[PDB]
Amino acid sequence: EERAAMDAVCAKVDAANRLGDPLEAFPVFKKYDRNGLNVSIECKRVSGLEPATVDWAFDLTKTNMQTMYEQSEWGWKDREKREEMTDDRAWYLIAWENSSVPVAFSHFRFDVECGDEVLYCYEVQLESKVRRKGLGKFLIQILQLMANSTQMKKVMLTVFKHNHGAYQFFREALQFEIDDSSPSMSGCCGEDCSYEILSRRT
Amino acid sequence: SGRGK
Ligand SMILES: *C(=O)CSCCNC(=O)CCNC(=O)[C@H](O)C(C)(C)COP(=O)(O)OP(=O)(O)OC[C@H]1O[C@@H](n2cnc3c(N)ncnc32)[C@H](O)[C@@H]1OP(=O)(O)O
Ligand SMILES: [N]
């Protein structure tokens, strides 16, 4: 009885991936108007985004992350990242300042990881000028809500150990745990990897 | 960012 287990899990993922607007029931999360911001938030599949929006999101990711990727074991390759960001399974939360200028986004997916239904956050990226205003925390709280409303078991993400601000944001401010799949949770002599996998159960 | 193993 091993296919029955993954079938219940994959059914829930497949259903979430057929949703229209995962935030339709939650209009209060479509605005963030604190600390000088006036943002409107939308949740769309990548197929619903304009090409210039995808370009902005890729460029913001590259600006913020390219050096940190090269400092890691992964490296940075434009094509690999663009293909990941434009996969048909990609979902986006996009924050538009004054409903007009894109200033932040998350790329997330409903997927199976280690036999569990999860919401995987593949990116959370803010322009520098909108940081330390609570917007990133709010976007992650939206992800947590969507994980609950679709019956996922956790929100998961990867963070570089050398991305010290993001590590403190997730681990301390948002109290994500180190996931059992993280490299640090294998081996009893302190292995050496440059990222951690973090998660927060629903 | 990204999806590690
Ligand atoms: C893969 O995508 C997962 S790892 C994230 C990778 N993205 C990344 O590095 C992009 C660049 N950084 C950001 O876009 C942004 O800095 C975030 C997304 C990392 C955090 O977003 P915010 O700037 O909106 O954070 P807030 O919601 O305002 O912060 C809440 C509390 O978290 C701590 N925090 C956040 N940044 C911190 C930094 N650089 N250093 C220390 N602590 C940080 C604070 O406790 C913060 O509350 P405060 O009241 O002190 O502001
Ligand atoms: N992992």
Q: What is the DSSP letter of A187?
A: -
Lookup: tokens for A17: 């991936």
Interface residue of A77, A82, A106, A158 to substitute, partner B, most B CBs within 10 Å: A158
Whose atoms come closest to the Cα of B5: which ligand? 2
Closest-CA residue of chain B to A180: B5
User: Could you tell me which of A3, A55, A6, A25 has the C-alpha nearest to residue A150?
Assistant: A25
Which method was used? X-ray
H or E segment and range at residue A117: strand A116-126
Give the dihedral sign, CA A62/A64/A68/A74.
negative
User: Could you tell me which of A127, A128, A123, A110 has the C-alpha nearest to residue A69?
Assistant: A123
H or E segment and range at residue A122: strand A116-126
Whether A176 has its CB under 8 Å from any CB of chain B: the answer is: no
Q: Which residues of B touch A (CB under 8 A)?
A: 1-5
CB A142 within 8 A of CB A124: no
Q: How far apart are CA B5 and CA A199, in angstroms?
A: 13
- CA angle at residue A168 from A131 to A62, to 5 degrees? 55
Asked if A183 lies within 8 A of B2 by C-beta distance, the reply is no
Stated resolution in angstroms: 1.4
Where do the structural domains in chain A lie, given as residue ranges? Answer: 1-202
The shortest CB-CB distance from A123 to any of B1, B4, B5 is to B1
Asked if A195 lies within 8 A of B3 by C-beta distance, the reply is no
Provide Rg for chain A, Cα atoms. 17
Please work out whether the CB of residue A184 comes within 6 Å of at least one atom of ligand 2: no
Q: What is the DSSP letter of A171?
A: I
Q: Is A113 helix (H, G, I), strand (E, B) or coil?
A: strand
CB A150 within 8 A of CB A15: yes
Whether A57 has its CB under 8 Å from any CB of chain B: the answer is: no
Q: How far apart are CA A138 and CA A11, in angstroms?
A: 28
Is A158 annotated as ligand-binding? Answer: yes
As to burial, measured by CB atoms within 10 angstroms (0-12 exposed, 13-18 middle, 19+ buried), residue A175 is exposed
Q: How far apart are CA A200 and CA A97, in angstroms?
A: 28
